[PDB]
Design a protein around this ligand. Structure first.
Ligand SMILES: O=C([O-])C(O)C(=O)[O-]
Ligand SMILES: [Cl-]
Ligand SMILES: [Cl-]
Length: 131
């Protein structure tokens, strides 16, 4: 459940940031991985977010949000998030990388994301507690 709640926070951060930026969403889901491969996560998640229309930087904020909520909770400095993201790329999903591309280097987006977390972490927790 310790790892399950982190899978929950991840999808909830994606979802709430998307909502704050005006993107349509449906409630995300959390489910157990049946794989016996030690290199895979045991708890998986899926988000349902319309990123078809949106601007590149807003989509990147949604893409960053999943891993970012942990950086925020753990106290990583905004200016250090680009390095931290790059170091963890092998463990960041390809779909998040597709939404972000190289905008993880943008310290102003990280500053913005942290500000949104500051203002909406309660909504993030409420959603995570419900999935
Ligand atoms: O692949 C993912 O990161 C996730 O399942 C999603 O696309 O919502
Ligand atoms: Cl909202
Ligand atoms: Cl919505």
């Amino acid at each position: 459940m310790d790892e399950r709640f982190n899978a929950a926070l991840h999808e909830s951060a994606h979802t709430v940031i998307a909502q704050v930026l005006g993107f349509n969403t449906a409630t995300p889901i959390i489910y157990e991985n049946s794989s016996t491969n030690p290199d895979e996560k045991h708890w998986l998640g899926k988000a349902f977010i319309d990123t078809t229309n949106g601007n590149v930087e807003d989509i990147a904020l949604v893409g960053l949000a999943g891993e970012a909520i942990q950086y925020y909770i753990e106290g990583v400095d905004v200016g250090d998030c680009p390095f931290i993201w790059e170091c963890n790329l092998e463990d960041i999903s390809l779909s998040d990388q597709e939404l972000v591309k190289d905008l993880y280097n943008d310290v102003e987006l990280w500053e913005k994301l942290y500000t949104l977390f500051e203002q909406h972490h309660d909504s993030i927790l409420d959603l995570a507690n419900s999935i």
